Structure 1
Amino acid sequence: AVVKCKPTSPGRRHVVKVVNPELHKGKPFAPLLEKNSKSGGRNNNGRITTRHIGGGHKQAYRIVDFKRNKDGIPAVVERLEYDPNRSANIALVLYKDGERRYILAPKGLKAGDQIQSGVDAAIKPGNTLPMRNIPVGSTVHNVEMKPGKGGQLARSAGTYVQIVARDGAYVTLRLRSGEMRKVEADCRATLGEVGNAEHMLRVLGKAGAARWRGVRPTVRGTAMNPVDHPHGGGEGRNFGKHPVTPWGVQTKGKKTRSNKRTDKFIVRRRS
């Protein structure tokens, strides 16, 4: 549910919250957790390689089954859980043999729902099948890009892919970006959309809410000195140059894809 906060303080006036009472209020399933400590956006050279990363709340990693490889064994959704590591919610599922797994929560899924993977799994949200067994036109998420590798496409809250055509060993998919893309029809996908679609409707409201998520401030290039950034300098507010990255590449329209190895799988780019 999308809920506005009352303006009892200026940092709360513009806050808009996404409240989901269905989400488990207790602790997550301990055997599927592992630690994941923060990087500050620094690599193994200790250098910042991605700016604006630091701080934010401590988070444990939930081992999510993106492969959905447990074919022919039914599972029942025990509960939906908040996952700090991603926009989508996750579902703790219990298989009939006694194994528990986390999956991405599809839209509509709730406690008690049954799911199944495999070639003969029914066409129902949450079920996972090779895409050669999924009707053309269907809406899917957690799409594999190579068979058995595990889902890599349409995993964020609200996202989905459409299977638009099947041609031989390949299907043509319409990605959320608008790109038309081919992957092998043996790649697995899960029926339905990723849930938590109202995720984009939240409004952080204040600076500290970005800080809680481990986002550090962005400093505009034009606010600096020339030594720091191509945009730097000027007596007063000056610009007078074509916008570039800190490293000098044009940053308004200039294209950067260069992967001749995967060009064959792109039917048409997003535009």
Structure 2
Amino acid sequence: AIKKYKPITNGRRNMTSLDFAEITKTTPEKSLLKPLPKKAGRNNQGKLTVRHHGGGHKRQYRVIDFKRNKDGINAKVDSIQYDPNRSANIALVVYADGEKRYIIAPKGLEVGQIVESGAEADIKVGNALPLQNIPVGTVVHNIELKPGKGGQIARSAGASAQVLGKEGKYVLIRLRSGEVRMILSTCRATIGQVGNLQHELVNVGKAGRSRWKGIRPTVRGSVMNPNDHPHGGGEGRAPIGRPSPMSPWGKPTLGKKTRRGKKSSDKLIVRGR
């Protein structure tokens, strides 16, 4: 899974990478591609509103079926492919009527395997079902919050959640974060865990590789000036020098909770992370 580079240079020293053995086709499905120009963290006013985004390799977008709403028709896993837009890999599947779609690639999905969706689908990896029909204790991913909107939860590499119980209109689920919350039982989920489990272990190794990923450098608050940052100024190095560490925009940033009050989901959230 993980390949460790030899220290031929100080740049490569301690660097690692995925071996991409899971990938079975190295080019994408042409008809499922769309252009994805970079925003570099700049909004519709043309202003930088999120720091540290910019540059990086050009990417095409792969249209991904998060909805899994094509029910009662088998689809055969043509290939597992790399996708630059997300940590998970993606499986190109071919339905029995000849329509082709990308899905998040679950752990253990193999080329030639069959997947299905709907209330009658079997409980096996890659099948999509309403939480109504998914048994208690099952590990799932790509979970909807609103029926028919498409999966929004547990889509990263290695992500999964566990079905815990079934109230009347809602099913209890334990999310990767540890939160236990209710989700409408008409919402769908895909059986299994998202694949590419070694993603998090990669040692990026050098600054340039982050740059290829489109991440620009993070300048620490303490090495700016007072007009730049609450931590700026001071002669020589200085400690934080106030009761709490502060964000660049002057808000406390260590332990201060920011979840807004009076949210609709607060009565659905059973146990915080």
Q: Same fold (TM over 0.5)?
A: yes
- C-alpha deviation, 1:21, in angstroms: 2.1
Q: Could you tell me how far apart the structure 1 residues matched to 2:22 and 2:123 are?
A: 25
Aligned to 1:191: 191
Which amino acid is the alignment partner of residue 251 of structure 1?
T
* Counterpart position of 1:63: 63
| Residue 262 (structure 1) aligned with residue 265 (structure 2) | yes
Count of residues in correspondence between the two structures: 270
Distance in 2 of aligned mates of 1:121 and 1:133: 9
Q: Say whether residues 1:110 and 2:110 are aligned partners.
A: yes
Q: Does 1:228 align with 2:248?
A: no
Aligned pairs for 1:123-162 (under 5 A) are 123-162=123-162
1:36 aligns with 2:45: no
Contact 2:77 2:114 in 1 (8 A): yes
Shift of 1:26: 3.3
Moved over 6 A (4+): none
Q: Which amino acid aligns with 2:198?
A: E
> Once structures 1 and 2 are overlaid, which stretch shifts more, 238-247 or 214-223?
238-247
Q: Distance in 2 between matches of 1:22 and 1:153?
A: 23
Normalising to structure 1: TM-score of the pair? 0.98
Deviation for aligned residue 1:148: 0.6
What do you get for the CA RMSD once the two structures are aligned? 0.8
Q: What per-residue deviation string (whole Å, max 9, x for no partner) do you get for residues 130-180 of structure 1?
A: 011010110000000011110000000000010111111100110111111
Work out the percentage of aligned pairs sharing the same amino acid: 59
Q: What residue is the counterpart of 1:120 in the other structure? A: 120
> CA separation in 2, counterparts of 1:22 and 1:248?
46
Q: 2:36 and 2:260 mapped to 1: Cα distance? A: 32
Q: CA deviation at 1:25?
A: 4.2
CA shift digits 1:18-74 (9 cap, x unpaired): 112231343200110000100010000111110000000000000000000000000
Unaligned segments of structure 1, at least 5 residues = none
* TM-score normalized by the length of structure 2: 0.97
Amino acid at match of 2:213: R
Is 2:17 aligned against 1:17? Answer: yes
Tell me the amino acid that sits aligned with residue 175 of structure 1.
L
1:14 positional shift: 1.3
